């Protein structure tokens, strides 16, 4: 097993080469790309999905790795479909929280990011952030 490839690919990461460029060059060279490296670059793809979703709709806040992973898996790695589903899913949750008196101005966008897009965990965090201002104003 010629493990020369992954060490050279790990050189490219050290020098700062783009994973897509490493992959595209290997495919143009007819070289078998090590599946272990592709699988290990999943976090890079999910960060790619998340920031593309942020570019697609500023004002929905930052997208979590958990939300990008669900969209990306559900769309079978189709990058454009994953970003669109990522955006549509988040907009639904921002509206769901909005319907409970928690809009973007109240910090719902940041609570959805901090909790991977779980509406239940975000609602509990937002309730706490309403309770602490009262605790410190009621005592002072």
């Amino acid at each position: 097993e010629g493990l020369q490839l992954v060490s050279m690919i790990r050189e490219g990461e050290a020098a700062g080469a783009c994973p897509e460029e490493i992959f595209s060059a290997l495919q143009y060279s007819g070289t078998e790309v090590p599946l272990q490296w592709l699988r290990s670059e999943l976090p890079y793809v999910l960060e790619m999905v998340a920031e593309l979703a942020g570019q697609q709709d500023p004002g929905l806040g930052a997208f979590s790795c958990q939300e990008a992973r669900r969209a990306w898996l559900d769309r079978h790695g189709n990058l454009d479909e994953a970003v669109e589903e990522c955006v549509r899913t988040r907009r639904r949750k921002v509206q769901e929280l909005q319907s409970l008196g928690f809009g973007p101005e109240e910090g719902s966008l940041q609570a959805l990011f901090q909790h991977g897009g779980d509406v239940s965990r975000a609602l509990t965090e937002l309730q706490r952030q309403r309770l602490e201002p009262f605790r410190q104003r009621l005592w002072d």
Binding site: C18, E20, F23, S24, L38, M48, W72
Partner: peptide
């Protein structure tokens, strides 16, 4: 380059699966 990102995403999913 946008084609390269799309290829990478699809390739990484094939590898994962």
């Amino acid at each position: 380059d946008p084609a390269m990102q799309r290829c990478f995403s699809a390739a990484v999913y094939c590898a994962i699966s």
